[PDB]
Amino acid sequence: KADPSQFELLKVLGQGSFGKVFLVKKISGSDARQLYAMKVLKKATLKVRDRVRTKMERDILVEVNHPFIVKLHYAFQTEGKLYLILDFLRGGDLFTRLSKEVMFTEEDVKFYLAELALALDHLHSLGIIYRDLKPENILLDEEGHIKLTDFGLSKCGTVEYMAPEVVNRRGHTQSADWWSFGVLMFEMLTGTLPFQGKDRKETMTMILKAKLGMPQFLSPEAQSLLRMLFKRNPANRLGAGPDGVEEIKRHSFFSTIDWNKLYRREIHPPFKPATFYFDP
Numbered sequence: 110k111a112d113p114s115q116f117e118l119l120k121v122l123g124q125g126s127f128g129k130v131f132l133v134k135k136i137s138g139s140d141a142r143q144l145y146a147m148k149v150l151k152k153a154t155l156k157v158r159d160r161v162r163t164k165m166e167r168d169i170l171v172e173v174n175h176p177f178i179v180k181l182h183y184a185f186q187t188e189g190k191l192y193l194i195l196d197f198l199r200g201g202d203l204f205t206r207l208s209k210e211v212m213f214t215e216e217d218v219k220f221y222l223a224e225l226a227l228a229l230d231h232l233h234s235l236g237i238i239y240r241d242l243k244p245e246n247i248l249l250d251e252e253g254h255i256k257l258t259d260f261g262l263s264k265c266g267t268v269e270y271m272a273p274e275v276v277n278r279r280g281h282t283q284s285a286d287w288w289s290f291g292v293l294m295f296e297m298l299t300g301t302l303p304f305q306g307k308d309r310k311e312t313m314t315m316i317l318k319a320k321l322g323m324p325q326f327l328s329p330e331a332q333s334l335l336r337m338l339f340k341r342n343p344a345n346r347l348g349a350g351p352d353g354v355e356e357i358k359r360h361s362f363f364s365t366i367d368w369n370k371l372y373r374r375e376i377h378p379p380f381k382p383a384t385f386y387f388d389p
């Protein structure tokens with residue numbers, strides 16, 4: 110029953126390889142006056158191979174139901190367009206936050222990573238992996254909690270976050286997601302990528318071959334988790350073992366986290382998105 114005429118276009122949020130994203134307002138029904146992001150894709154720009162992908166991307170968001178992953182409200186099509194109605198996130202993104210603070214404190218990082226660990230495990234329980242886990246894809250809501258975007262959802266990319274088995278085209282499993290999580294952790298704490306060369310080729314060679322030089326301002330606990338996430342063999346990596354995410358959750362780095370209070374959004378976030386008068 111849902112169609113494009115049921116949504117008032119306010120402003121265009123962005124545009125790229127995906128399609129065009131608008132900030133829309135629902136005009137009809139129970140959720141009338143509610144704001145959303147409308148992702149529009151033109152069928153003419155999608156090829157026979159690109160068609161199967163978008164299909165799977167909608168087929169994934171329908172299965173996904175987690176507080177730290179973007180919700181698909183509606184999805185519909187026309188003769189030449191494909192629409193996805195998703196959450197509108199006011200809070201911003203980690204990319205914009207990190208580029209502003211330069212580096213986050215251990216306490217800030219611990220919060221974002223704990224929230225992300227729950228979202229990644231949910232995806233892995235459904236047989237889904239996150240192809241491009243970078244800070245551009247981690248949005249923040251009105252309260253300051255994370256929301257993982259759908260751009261990287263799967264059953265090309267930023268090489269700096271790619272695991273050795275992915276650089277070497279050997280396969281993207283859930284273990285490759287725990288490497289990118291370490292890359293993300295490292296970047297948040299140092300303000301620098303762990304593997305970075307003079308160009309893309311040297312960076313990729315270093316992801317495969319370079320020993321990581323651990324900056325010593327990193328706490329003993331942060332260093333232990335990174336060393337364990339940065340194993341070249343994916344079967345040796347933290348999160349690949351018998352208890353999976355419980356290996357990450359039980360790590361000393363996360364010992365101050367209450368995984369129950371964090372899930373229910375009872376833990377106060379590091380950032381809270383957007384008085385003088387006096388009389389006796």
Ligand SMILES: CC(C)CCN1c2nc(Nc3cc(F)c(O)c(F)c3)ncc2N(C)C(=O)[C@H]1C
Pocket residue numbers: 122123124130146147148179195196197198199201202248257258259260
């Ligand atoms: C062009 C896209 C990348 C712009 C992304 N973006 C936003 N996106 C969303 N929701 C949203 C969630 C999705 F899972 C999704 O795939 C999507 F298309 C949109 N809300 C608010 C913003 N605002 C205000 C922004 O400035 C930037 C950060």
